[PDB]
Symmetry: D2
Subunit: 386 residues, 4 copies
């Protein structure tokens, strides 16, 4: 039951199932994985593909010959399995040189280095077939108020993204960029901390059509925000280029639980929205199998990400198809929400006495919205209790 196949477009970062379990208070609990092994094991579970940071696929500091062999072995694993590489990203956070940021480091030489490291990896990502290049500015931010003038930092961040767009255009590449917001951790506060801040920033770039967002479930929940609402705004803007799926229990450190863990009802409404909107990109899991697990638990955790998506997909589709739910949606006026407020135009609205002078405010106020009945139908569908 609920068995994934590559057609479901489920993808995993090499750093997810490859996480060795080091945390701020703990040493590694698992040995490092060869990317080749991760590709094979994920393919056996029904995954569609994998994603990578530059430094996950090629150890930092590798010589050209070593780099060529790493890529060759990875390419052979992709060929052996039929796995794809839909997205890649740059590691601009692990190395100490990035301790104050990459694109917005106060040191200009570090900013130039970060751009060169990214451009090198864009070339590789294109070679491996990626359609999206993600930027997660995890080190862009501050622990103290004097350390970062944010207007200057946003100037530098715009310059960096503009140069990357000039670069991909210069090479004729079709790849597009997706900014992954996060509100905090590892910096005390991170620039572009939410989907909204990232969407707003893109609109000031030179070529905004090249940039979208890669929202992550847990990151918007770390700000206490409603992730399905933020996804709806990204879709409304035409900017949901990619998504990171995982679980998070509220406002605390970034947990990266498997998808479906954390806020289960939010996971249900997310799947409902992605399927209703026809999102066609990768269903990418950015999760960490807990460091309590051995390698068998790693693969059980990855399998559970995909299983939970498929269960929620079934339950959301049953909800929207149920005639009793369709009647409840009309009872709650979701049909009226989708109708224009004033297609008659401004002057007609101003002249419409039923909109003000003769509007019976008390009769309107007395009409219940029937949202609790609708939501209990949604709960009954989610739980299989209809």
């Amino acid at each position: 039951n609920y068995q994934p196949t590559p057609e479901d477009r489920f993808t995993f970062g090499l750093w997810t199932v490859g996480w060795q379990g080091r945390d701020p208070f703990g040493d590694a609990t698992r040995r490092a994985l060869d990317p080749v092994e991760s590709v094979r094991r994920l393919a056996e579970l029904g995954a569609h593909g994998v994603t990578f940071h530059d430094d996950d696929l090629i150890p930092f500091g590798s010589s050209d010959s070593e780099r060529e062999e790493h890529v060759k072995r990875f390419r052979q694993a992709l060929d052996d399995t039929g796995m794809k590489v839909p997205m890649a990203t740059t590691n601009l956070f692990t190395h100490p040189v990035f301790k104050d940021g990459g694109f917005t480091a106060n040191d200009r030489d570090v900013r130039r280095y970060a751009l060169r490291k990214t451009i090198r990896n864009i070339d590789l990502a294109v070679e491996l077939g990626a359609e999206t290049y993600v930027a997660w500015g995890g080190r862009e931010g501050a622990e103290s108020g004097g350390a970062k003038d944010v207007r200057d930092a946003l100037d530098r961040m715009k310059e960096a993204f503009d140069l990357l767009g000039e670069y991909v255009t210069s090479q004729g590449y079709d790849i597009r960029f997706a900014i992954e917001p996060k509100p905090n951790e590892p910096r005390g506060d991170i620039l572009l901390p939410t989907v909204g801040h990232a969407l707003a920033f893109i609109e000031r770039l030179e070529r905004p059509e090249l940039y979208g967002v890669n929202p992550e479930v847990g990151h918007e929940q770390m700000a206490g925000l409603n992730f399905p609402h933020g996804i709806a705004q990204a879709l409304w803007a035409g900017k949901l280029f990619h998504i990171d799926l995982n679980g998070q229990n509220g406002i605390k450190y970034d947990q990266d639980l498997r998808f479906g863990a954390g806020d289960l009802r939010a996971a249900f409404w997310l799947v409902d929205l992605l399927e209703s909107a026809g999102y066609s990109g990768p269903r990418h899991f950015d999760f960490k199998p807990p460091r309590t697990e051995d390698f068998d638990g790693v693969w059980a955790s990855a399998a559970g990400c995909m299983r939970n998506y498929l269960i929620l997909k079934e339950r959301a589709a049953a909800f929207r198809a149920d005639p009793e739910v369709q009647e409840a949606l009309r009872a709650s006026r979701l049909d009226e929400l989708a109708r224009p407020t004033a297609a008659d135009g401004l002057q007609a609205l101003l002249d419409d006495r039923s909109a003000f002078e003769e509007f019976d405010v008390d009769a309107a106020a007395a009409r219940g919205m029937a949202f609790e009945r609708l939501d209990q139908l949604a709960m009954d569908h989610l739980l299989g209790a209809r």
Copy 2:
């Protein structure tokens, strides 16, 4: 010491000092105030002006003759004191008809009513001299996932703001709109929950130049976000049309404490940024004197808002003017953050071996940023301990 005068541009909502102290668990602890009295008492404290919701100035349901007398008395209080009215707003949240929203109510007749109620008050706001019209969509949102399709709701919200822009343009008014974000409360989640989401939405409106943000200290802090950072992004976008100043202790209900209470260091960095950026709009307090207070405590609380702004203004200016701080800012490379990363252009960056092939990553990583020394100078300045 620290005595405000009207030139400091401090303004207060009638609903702030007028709050009677009703909370979700408590009846009123103070009698209602006549707006005329609030104008007089605020003017005596050194305020520049006042702001209003339609229903603060004219009781809901007033006849035309009553409305004319309310406005006449208010105008005479403004004339007697020299107080101004720089901003007004519509109450689209108190009346039960708005229980599911105003501009994004599922009922289309309620959406049309909300627009007509707003347009009536825009006319009054212009008559009283307001330069900004604020929209706080406190009822726009949901407690459950099925109750609001957010893409449809954003369609309705765009339609509403577009019609309001068509209206002000049709009348030749100079007033501009400012959206006030809030993440939650009274709805479980509110649409446009942060500065970023509001900035992003404005960019999809028909006439984006007419709309900016009215961020509130406590609202961004209710999402755990850094308010000075969000203000910097709004300034970077050219969209800080107005601001609401108050205090909040972290992620919990909207406290609306007096400015300077709550997160004191964030208040310091906010004042530093507003003064450095040359923000020229009203310094508006959206606060509630705690319901423990009598009327004398109300005015003490309002006075404390202005006092705390003026103390922080002095301390931030002393910080930025101190030669030892200026040296520390250079030591931490804030000068380098303000320099373009690659004014030499993309090809020059790609050909620059000092940016990659010959970049000494370890030497760069070893350079301390000296941010702790800088931040302790900032603390010493804030505390008057230099």
Copy 3:
């Protein structure tokens, strides 16, 4: 399916289904309910009983004759339906006199009044059959640091609870007290903010055996705490005298959603624990039907509280009874967690070389805990996807 009956011990506060929908930003959306009607409608839904604050059952300020008639009508509704009254409480938060607290008000005359108001209602609660008397100190706390010396306030709170215990002992009553913690709202911070702080305080009372806790799902979640863990500690202490069931979406204002809404997985683990531990008290819902609802939605929301408890009870029981889960629990060493660490005693442990000198730390570290497989079995059971 999932139909409650009085044997399931579900109870509701009169203030829950009776909530008129006033919030900090909104007027009432529903008319007041007669307690008699609430008793009848709840009984028809399958409830076991109701609970009350003094001022829910008898309007504040009633004369003795009015008080007698209110009680008489309520008693007749209980007799007509077979509903019980297992718990009552005092309203020490709505009236303005309590603006700085009841038992810990700075004014001594208010503290004495609060005690007298409570004692009057203890007598009534006993007359109506209540076994538990709840204290929720919603006004005990502060918005500012100077306003409340907390050691002195805890002295006053101990004095109050000690006097109430002296009173019930003096009358020969069997009723016991349960303190309901909440971290904040309506005060900026509330004294005894969590289950732990309340348990710790009880241990300093004169007669600790008379006092336990009445934890509420949403209140511990407002501090980001794990409600099943806090319930387990209360059960471990022998102090779970009563419980308040509802839903909450994380750290924000007190939402009081219907049970099962909010954090669904936490609701599952709570029901699992209450049923496994054999909790025999009332399953009391302290919830507010959202103000979007009409009276039909009120009863739909109350019905959904009970339905969701019964669904989760079925799924948790199926989880614990499944032989595959029982094998997974052994694989994860939950059996070993329940065995004493050192029943052999201290000297035997000190002399046991297998505990230190010869303990193979690496072999132990390499053993996976298999928690992800266990948790996916739990998810499959909760979702009915086995």
Copy 4:
């Protein structure tokens, strides 16, 4: 100005200034420090002493000869500087064997190992002069509901603390234990997550007088709780055996900023309370210099912890000594809060008509508490703006 000396009792963990800067997303930015160097540098800054985990002072896995040399060098640094060692603790979190806990690990052999590792270090702590032994159960908890039966885990935690008390009693040691709560991180939820839960647990131990709490500023703030309030409850219980001072910006990952950073007003009210209550234990800083800093920034950050404590101590003492504040405290009835509610006894209260039948509730309700004036005096004192 504000220069610390050893008489101020400021202490630092070796792991604080010794933190190399590894975070969940970043490699080390600083070289490891020799404990001898940290002792010397801290002594030069005016510190009183240092604290240690076993594995900070002696590398894990050291032979007896290596252990003896590590201790010998450390003892010579203490002798050379006059630094003391007032507290020590065990590392039961870094090694992978502790991935599911130490005292509450599901594996019984790990629980026995954790006890033996602790007992070995208690002996060393006593040899070095420590008066307090801290337990921070950072790995005691869970990411999922099935993985840990919390009642069984609390049984195991009680067994462990009881055995440690039996051990110290058996040796005639005077050292006492202090439990350090934390709500989450590194586990999804940690057992005994707050001061209150720890205080409540101690009351169920065999010899409760041997155990107190070691609360940390940032940890209670990670639950959104008011740290001065929790400290007041610990003092009220007689259980403040030790304290960890640092800074935290609200509900997010554990930041461990230097003391005075984070919530400055809470730091002021904490210092006010510690000084007013006459707390005589170490003023211990559990902080991490940010990984942006070099070694000079490490010592600047440590110096700033002590400076900020001394500034706040001066400002709080000036507040409490100011006759205008003393008058404001009487105006707000803080004197009445410290008076018994009913020293006349229960029967006198029941017979006192001024407490109920003749209490003028409206006159009492109308009396303002004057808390805003009091709090602005506190702000003026903190800012040096009187």
